Design an enzyme around this catalytic site. Structure first.
Site, PDB file in Angstrom:
ATOM      1  N   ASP B  29       0.834  -1.195   0.000  1.00  0.00           N
ATOM      2  CA  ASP B  29       0.000   0.000   0.000  1.00  0.00           C
ATOM      3  C   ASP B  29       0.873   1.251   0.000  1.00  0.00           C
ATOM      4  OD1 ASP B  29      -3.263   0.335   0.849  1.00  0.00           O
ATOM      5  OD2 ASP B  29      -2.005   2.103   1.129  1.00  0.00           O
ATOM      6  N   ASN B  85     -13.186  -3.494   2.197  1.00  0.00           N
ATOM      7  CA  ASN B  85     -14.120  -2.394   2.414  1.00  0.00           C
ATOM      8  C   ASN B  85     -15.137  -2.323   1.283  1.00  0.00           C
ATOM      9  OD1 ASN B  85     -12.642  -1.607   4.706  1.00  0.00           O
ATOM     10  ND2 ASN B  85     -11.347  -0.214   3.505  1.00  0.00           N
ATOM     11  N   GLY B  91     -15.696   2.666   3.977  1.00  0.00           N
ATOM     12  CA  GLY B  91     -14.472   3.395   3.708  1.00  0.00           C
ATOM     13  C   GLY B  91     -13.726   2.927   2.479  1.00  0.00           C
ATOM     14  N   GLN B  92     -14.423   2.342   1.502  1.00  0.00           N
ATOM     15  CA  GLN B  92     -13.757   1.858   0.296  1.00  0.00           C
ATOM     16  C   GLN B  92     -13.146   3.021  -0.475  1.00  0.00           C
ATOM     17  OE1 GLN B  92     -16.221  -0.495  -2.337  1.00  0.00           O
ATOM     18  NE2 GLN B  92     -14.547  -0.848  -3.782  1.00  0.00           N
ATOM     19  N   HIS B  98     -10.346  -5.039  -3.493  1.00  0.00           N
ATOM     20  CA  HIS B  98      -8.995  -5.243  -2.994  1.00  0.00           C
ATOM     21  C   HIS B  98      -9.040  -5.736  -1.558  1.00  0.00           C
ATOM     22  CE1 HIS B  98     -10.051  -0.974  -2.430  1.00  0.00           C
ATOM     23  NE2 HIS B  98      -9.235  -0.919  -1.391  1.00  0.00           N
TER      24      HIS B  98
END
Ligand SMILES: [Cu+2]
Ligand SMILES: [Cu+2]
Ligand SMILES: [Cu+2]
Ligand SMILES: [Cu+2]
Ligand SMILES: [Cu+2]
Lengths: 116, 112
Positions: B29, B85, B91-92, B98
């Site tokens: 990330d 999410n 909160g995507q 993913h």
């Protein structure tokens, strides 16, 4: 060795301790968490006993994906139209409390970042 | 529509890739929330888990198996947390499904 094992989740699978069940099929069970961390908080578990995701087998892929498909269908059936968070905890750093694989589904409020 | 994760899959912009096969990609990330924080994404463009099809079940499980294998390779022997999410309440951040994998620290409860 009773099917599903003797964790609380194995007992719930065999109807030996009560649960508030949302959905059941031959592969899995969805039921509400007794210590909810969101207005809606439920669990999707396999009926097959797998202690933790780190020891899942390659041939468990379909079953693990089925947990997420059932999770998203249950979330829609529960009216979580603004969304939700799915969580799998592994081991001590993950905060895993029961060693039978389980998918948390949380919604009904804004979830925050980081996810713990 | 296309997303930044599509660009990453197509190798149009860089990411620190951990693992790849014919159907998924794992990479760190860009905004890590733990000492180890990576993503496992399908190459198939599923915008969000709420629209995934029954036929996608083994692909979704593949993300988790790849995720747990990458976690072991990255030394997360004390555990980790996997997160998907959905939508605004979840909160995507990118509308390409993913799987987050976070570890290297104690993860806390509630999970956000
Ligand atoms: Cu057991
Ligand atoms: Cu749990
Ligand atoms: Cu809050
Ligand atoms: Cu996200
Ligand atoms: Cu902390």
């Amino acid at each position: 060795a009773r099917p599903g094992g003797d964790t609380i989740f194995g007992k719930i699978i065999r109807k030996e301790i009560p649960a508030k069940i949302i959905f059941e099929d031959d592969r899995c069970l969805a039921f509400h968490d007794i210590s909810p961390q969101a207005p809606t908080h439920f669990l999707v578990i396999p009926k097959k006993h797998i202690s933790q995701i780190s020891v899942a087998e390659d041939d468990d892929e379909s079953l693990l994906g089925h947990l997420m498909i059932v999770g998203k269908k249950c979330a829609a059936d529960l009216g979580l139209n603004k969304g939700y968070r799915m969580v799998v905890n592994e081991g001590s750093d993950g905060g895993q409390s029961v060693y039978h694989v389980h998918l948390h589904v949380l919604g009904g409020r804004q979830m925050h970042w980081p996810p713990g």
